Ligand binder design. Structure first.
Ligand code: AG
Ligand code: AG
Ligand code: AG
Ligand code: AG
Ligand code: AG
Ligand code: AG
Ligand code: AG
Ligand code: AG
Ligand code: AG
Ligand code: AG
Ligand code: AG
Ligand code: AG
Ligand code: AG
Ligand code: AG
Ligand code: AG
Ligand code: AG
Ligand code: AG
Ligand code: AG
Ligand code: AG
Lengths: 323, 323
């Protein structure tokens, strides 16, 4: 492997200060401009609106327009300008660094896989939550589709197994994956109706397409809120924080363009404008950056290091989501 | 949208000359006759007085007497005589033109919002500075009211993200908004005492009302001075300038009239006589008009175009603050 933060050190250890517990939700296909906090005309995040300590970031751009391109870049040391997708898996990434320094890494996936990010770490630290073998919440809908909230089940046991250590938990969402947006949420989030069903998105009435997309966002609002609520059950023993960033956006009929995956040189802005949220308990001493900070996926790696009191010279002066 | 400047062209581009960086402070409720430079009996602008290259304009008349009426007119192509507040939001305005031409437009707001001026542009180019979500300077007074100087924090982040482009930054002030003028300034500006603190201004003793109003001007003097000082930190790489114009004046008990918003047809002179200041660095080549030029809000649009070397037929003959 080729290293980029061999110099990295953790300034303080959980035996002298409170251990730190962080949930990083890797979102899927969510657009910044369909978030209520960013000006959208519908209340797509009603549950997050009721939680104090949530920062919504209004100017975040993804590294690319697809899961395969963006997810390795989100955890990279290279930054979007120097990032290479084909050789990313051979580079030391930020999870490699945190694991080397003693942070317990867990990756639960209801999307696909880590796109190479977890490859160097033991297989037991990656868990497939797309099937009923691990996910207890797949029988809540007629498609028998496993839900993101299922990734929260049993995390109390993971904390008990790593009692006293620093912990970083990645939850890779099914989220707003298309084209069958109507399958991405249970009946309790079917607020906006009617919805488009079927696959020929250009043939669907446009408003019904948007309705299905917005209902999926409601289910993600719920998932992030329940992630924070879980972390709050551990706030006494742990300094708890939550980071959410979507891997890319989505086209929804603009210029007749749908879905994502366009090359960056010709991708419409809708495919790279993503939401990001950060929450932390009042005890942690962590302070968010201003909500209007110009941010990209390049901010994720220095954010994760900073959350765990880690200094790496490569990202020393890189903009983060927190101060 | 109804267009007025589709012909606009930029004569020189920032890839072949110095990029230009301009702050336009959109003022609030300030009266021209309470400015020291216009003959007021008190030194209400002590810090601006120490800065070389500031022109004070002694004869400026606002488009109207309220924020909702004046602010869209300040950015309009139509001029006061043809301006229609009810359809202003659907007209192409000067920020639309400059954005189309590639100038990076930013609007930070510690007042209310842009009154429709920014509505056609991406929402990430507007930022609310009335709350600690963005404003780092709120805990400086017993009301926790966020301060205009907080709009200057993190502007280096913005400049770095637009490195080498032309930039126009609007800062919409809380300024001298009443009736609670006493809330508008921190203690270091409480120079004139005693101060009116009642909401029913006609019940306050007249001198205490004046004192609160003048103290708030001292805070605006400080804010404008700090805006120029920030620009000065970029003057080697950028051609820097600062424009200040208030949106309207204020009645302070004359003929029993308080606050503002009087219809133009019978508004008192003190509600439309506003200060204007222009500052520029020596290298920009920008030259101010004579300080006693008869000016109105109609001069703002041609001033902004000229600062970025843009010509548009609609305002070719129009008087500006600069040559
Ligand atoms: Ag490197
Ligand atoms: Ag110790
Ligand atoms: Ag993803
Ligand atoms: Ag994706
Ligand atoms: Ag995955
Ligand atoms: Ag999926
Ligand atoms: Ag539609
Ligand atoms: Ag616990
Ligand atoms: Ag949309
Ligand atoms: Ag920071
Ligand atoms: Ag016209
Ligand atoms: Ag105003
Ligand atoms: Ag007076
Ligand atoms: Ag006003
Ligand atoms: Ag405003
Ligand atoms: Ag105000
Ligand atoms: Ag008096
Ligand atoms: Ag600079
Ligand atoms: Ag002139």
């Amino acid at each position: 492997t080729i290293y980029h933060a061999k110099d990295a050190v953790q300034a303080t250890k959980p035996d002298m200060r409170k251990p730190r517990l962080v949930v990083f939700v890797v979102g899927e296909t969510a657009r910044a401009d369909h978030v209520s906090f960013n000006g959208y005309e519908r209340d797509t995040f009603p549950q997050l609106a009721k939680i104090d300590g949530v920062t919504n970031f209004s100017n975040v751009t993804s590294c690319g327009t697809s899961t395969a391109y963006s997810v390795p870049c989100m955890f990279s040391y290279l930054g979007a300008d120097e990032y290479d997708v084909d050789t990313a898996k051979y580079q030391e990434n930020v999870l490699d660094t945190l694991d080397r320094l003693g942070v317990s890494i867990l990756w639960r996936d209801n999307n696909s896989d880590s796109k190479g990010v977890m490859d160097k770490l033991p297989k037991a630290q990656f868990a497939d939550y797309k099937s009923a073998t691990n996910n207890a919440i797949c029988n809540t809908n007629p498609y028998n589709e496993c839900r993101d909230v299922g990734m929260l089940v049993g995390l109390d046991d993971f904390v008990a197994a790593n009692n006293g250590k620093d912990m970083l938990i990645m939850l890779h969402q099914m989220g707003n994956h298309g084209p069958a947006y109507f399958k991405r949420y249970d009946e309790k989030f079917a607020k906006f109706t009617p919805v488009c069903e079927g696959n020929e998105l250009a043939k669907c009435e446009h408003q019904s397409l948007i309705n299905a997309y917005d209902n999926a966002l409601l289910a993600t609002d719920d998932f992030i809120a329940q992630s924070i609520q879980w972390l709050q059950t551990h706030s006494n023993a742990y300094d708890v924080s939550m980071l959410y960033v979507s891997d890319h956006g989505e086209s929804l009929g603009e210029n007749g363009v749908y879905l994502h995956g366009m090359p960056n040189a010709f991708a419409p802005k809708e495919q790279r404008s993503v939401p990001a949220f950060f929450w932390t308990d009042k005890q942690t001493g962590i302070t968010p950056m201003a909500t209007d900070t110009v941010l990209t996926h390049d901010a994720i790696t220095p954010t994760l290091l900073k959350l765990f009191d880690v200094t790496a010279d490569k990202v020393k002066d890189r903009t983060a989501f927190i101060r």
